Each structure stands twice: as structure tokens, then as C-alpha cells.
């Protein structure tokens, strides 16, 4: 899997839009581990368990972990916005609702390989985008 530069652009705007990256191009140092752990959880336990774990808002974590799931949703929406007409016949090009829970969206849409592939690519893009900035 090769990460495109447009995916990294989407990741940068999504990390700024949620609030991972501050106005001085800095981020809390724990989001690096958050994204790495999300990738590991997706590869090991599965898409749904990892999404449920990192989507939870009533955490004991130092920072807001659910913002990485928000960044995921924004990156996936940006990726789907550029889907071609012939892609929309095979792939689902509908936009994920902003207030919708990502885990329940995945569950209602099944467990299709499209969603898992998009999540993995977006997680790698998030990791690469964080690698471009300073850890506080």
C-alpha cells in the first residue's frame, strides 16, 4: 500500500480541523502513541473493537483520544469526495454524517473490505502527517 500525497494533505487538514495540531504547528506527544496503538489494534483485534475503544469519550486517558477517530472520519470523507463515477458503482461514495458514531456506521454498513482498507490507509496517513510536526 502506497500513501498518496493527497491523503497526507487530507490528514493534515483533518488534524488541524479537529485540534490535534496547534496554531504553532505542535501537537501533544501522546497522540503519536494513540495513532500507533490504533493501527496495532486494527491489525490485531479488528476494525470494530479498535474503533469502539478509541471512539470512547469517557476515558481515563491524558488527552482526547476520540479526536483521532474524528480525524479518521474527516480523512475518509475527503477520500470519498474524490471518488470517480465508475468508483461509486463499486465503492460506497456516500459521506459519513458528522454526528454519526463511526463504529455504528461501520456495523450498519457491515464489515466490508472497503471500510477496513480506508481506515488502514487513513491511519497510516495520520501517522505520516504527525511525523511532519513537532511533539510539543
Amino acid at each position: 500500500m502506497k500513501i498518496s500525497k493527497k491523503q497526507i494533505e487530507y490528514a493534515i487538514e483533518a488534524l488541524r480541523a479537529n485540534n490535534i495540531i496547534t496554531n504553532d504547528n505542535q501537537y501533544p506527544k501522546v497522540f503519536k502513541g494513540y495513532i500507533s496503538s490504533f493501527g496495532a489494534a486494527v491489525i490485531q483485534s479488528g476494525l470494530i473493537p479498535a474503533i469502539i475503544f478509541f471512539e470512547n469519550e469517557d476515558n481515563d486517558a491524558n488527552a482526547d483520544r476520540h479526536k483521532i477517530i474524528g480525524v479518521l472520519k474527516d480523512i475518509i470523507n475527503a477520500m470519498r469526495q474524490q471518488y470517480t463515477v465508475t468508483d461509486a458503482t463499486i465503492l460506497v461514495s456516500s459521506q459519513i454524517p458528522a454526528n454519526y458514531s463511526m463504529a455504528q456506521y461501520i456495523i450498519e454498513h457491515g464489515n466490508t473490505d472497503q471500510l477496513l482498507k480506508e481506515i488502514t490507509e487513513a491511519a497510516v496517513a495520520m501517522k505520516l502527517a504527525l511525523r511532519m510536526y513537532k511533539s510539543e
Partner: protein, 314 residues
């Protein structure tokens, strides 16, 4: 089906623990905060855990018999009770009630609990003086590390083999031959095919009368004793369970504090100026005894400092 794992009527334990664990069932909710704390979710995870912890292993298991045929005669050691944990760092957690929070190391094909050969090799090497890499961060503790471990290795070698005296350079050469299969440096020794030390995967061999997997709790109490604790439920290998360690070990020939090949040592023996005082030999059986002593000393797995993963002789 429920017990006696076998190959014809079983569910892959790794599959059950990782992929089938969080299956979406009707009326079961663990996406919402209410669902994660509900009693229905607790019952669902309780049933899944009971399915996980119901399998036994017979001594005459065709799986274990095939392992014995492929990897040779095993080293059978028995688990004592704190339990035994492997692969604790594998992500398995959602935030629900009654679920296993830590990971477990399962074989993909067979599904049996096992210890990877990398884990055994690292655990055995950690008790040797030259396991720590000479680095900027490690240079403060580097002298004490080697000084402490060299004495331990010396007494253990004197115990397991007939060698009365061993030097620090000899211990270094033996360690680098066993684990690196080279010289202390970067040089390669011309070794035969059989002159290699291989650390296979340790497998669960036989749960005599009972299951091989159990559930355990670690309940951290935070820095504030006035706040509530945090029950963490994980999966462990039950005590009184036989673990089969498989190795492929050779005979190590040391002459004048250097590791020699078998044909090299034959040629050295044939020479006129052959000093028998400078010749040392540790056989595969003595290597196995050394590894057994190390394992009985420190154990293997996760949370070994708090007791988990200690072994006794079968």
C-alpha cells in the same frame, strides 16, 4: 467440542480470543457508555470467556506428537501458580465490562497457547553478560550488568559441565557462538549445518486434568487511595500445565578462548602442540541443562517480576 481440543472438534483459540470475541449479536450493545457497563454485555463476555477457558489438552495429542516428531525430544517443564502470560502487549481492549483487557499469544494455525522462540531466546540471553548492547544510554549500567551476569554464567557452567575454570573471554565466545553464531566482533565461524543453535517455539503440552487457560485479575490502586480501584481481567495459562520447550543445540568447541568448528577442533587435536588445558567442550545435553537452569531461575513470559511464568521440573 467443549473440552479436549484435538483437531476434529475444536474452535481456534486465537480466533475465538481475537476475531470472534467482539462479534456483533442482537440485543448486545457495547458502543454506548450504557452498553459497555450493562449486565447483558457482561453476560456476553462471560459466555465468550467460558468458551475460551473450557479446553483441555491430552498428553497423546496428535498436535503435540507432530511437534515432537518435527522438533525432536522436548524439555518438559510445569507451570506453577501465579499463572503464565505470553503476548501481554497485544492490543485486545474496547472498554467493556467482563472482557479480557490484555493480549495473549496464540499460534495462528493450531490455536494452542505458545511461547515464540524469540521470547525463549531473549529470555535465555538476558541472563548472559553480553546481552546488553554497548550504547550511549546503556554505558552507565554496562559494567555492572556484565560483572553480575558473568559470575552467574560461570557458576552455572561449572555446575552443568565438567569445566573447572572458565575465563571472561571464553564466556563471551560461548555466548556469541550460541546466540549470534559468530565471534565476539563481527567475524563468521565456518560452521556445519548441524553446528547451529535453534530456539523453537514452546508449546503447551498437556493439561492433565483441567483446562489450560484461566482468567486472572490485576487491580491497580492509583496514587490516590481515596479513589476507586481498576479491575483488569486477563487470560493466563493455568498452573500444573506442561510446557514443551524445543531446541536444536550442538556441541561447542573452545580452544585457547576461541570458538572452533568440529573439523577445526579435529585438526587442532591432530597437531603436535595441542594443549588439552586450553580445550573446552560443552555438549548439547549440557547446553540443555544450562537453559533449563536459567528457565527454572527466572522463568518466561510477562509479569515475571511479580511471579508469573515460573516453571518446575515435570
Amino acid at each position: 467440542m467443549p473440552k479436549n481440543y484435538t483437531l476434529q472438534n475444536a474452535s481456534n483459540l486465537g480466533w475465538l480470543f481475537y476475531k470472534d470475541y467482539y462479534r456483533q449479536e442482537p440485543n448486545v450493545d457495547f458502543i454506548s457508555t450504557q452498553g459497555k457497563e450493562s449486565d447483558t454485555t457482561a453476560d456476553f463476555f462471560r459466555k465468550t470467556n467460558q468458551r475460551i477457558t473450557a479446553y483441555q489438552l491430552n498428553s497423546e495429542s496428535p498436535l503435540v506428537a507432530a511437534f515432537n516428531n518435527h522438533f525432536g525430544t522436548p524439555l518438559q517443564l510445569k507451570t506453577i501458580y501465579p499463572g503464565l502470560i505470553t503476548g501481554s502487549g497485544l492490543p485486545h481492549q474496547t472498554g467493556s465490562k467482563g472482557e479480557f483487557k490484555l493480549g495473549f499469544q496464540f499460534d495462528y494455525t493450531t490455536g494452542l497457547p505458545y511461547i515464540p522462540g524469540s521470547s525463549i531466546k531473549g529470555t535465555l540471553r538476558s541472563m548472559f553478560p553480553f546481552s546488553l548492547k554497548d550504547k550511549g544510554s546503556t554505558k552507565r549500567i554496562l559494567p555492572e550488568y556484565r560483572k553480575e551476569r558473568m559470575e552467574y554464567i560461570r557458576d552455572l557452567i561449572i555446575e552443568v559441565t565438567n569445566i573447572n575454570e572458565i575465563s571472561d573471554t571464553e564466556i563471551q565466545a560461548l555466548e556469541y557462538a550460541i546466540f549470534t553464531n559468530s565471534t565476539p566482533s563481527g567475524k563468521t565461524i565456518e560452521f556445519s549445518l548441524e553446528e547451529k543453535d535453534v530456539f523453537y517455539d514452546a508449546f503447551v503440552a498437556d493439561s492433565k486434568d483441567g483446562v489450560m487457560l484461566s482468567d486472572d485479575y490485576i487491580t491497580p490502586h492509583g496514587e490516590n487511595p481515596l479513589k476507586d480501584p481498576k479491575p483488569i481481567l486477563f487470560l493466563k495459562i493455568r498452573p500444573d500445565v506442561t510446557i514443551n520447550f524445543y531446541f536444536k543445540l550442538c556441541t561447542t568447541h573452545l580452544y585457547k578462548e576461541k570458538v572452533c568448528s568440529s573439523k577445526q577442533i579435529e585438526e587442532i587435536k591432530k597437531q603436535n602442540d595441542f594443549s588439552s588445558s586450553d580445550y573446552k567442550m560443552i555438549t548439547a545435553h549440557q547446553k540443555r541443562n544450562l537453559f533449563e537452569k536459567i528457565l527454572l531461575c527466572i522463568g518466561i513470559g510477562a509479569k515475571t517480576n511479580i511471579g508469573y511464568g515460573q516453571l518446575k521440573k515435570l
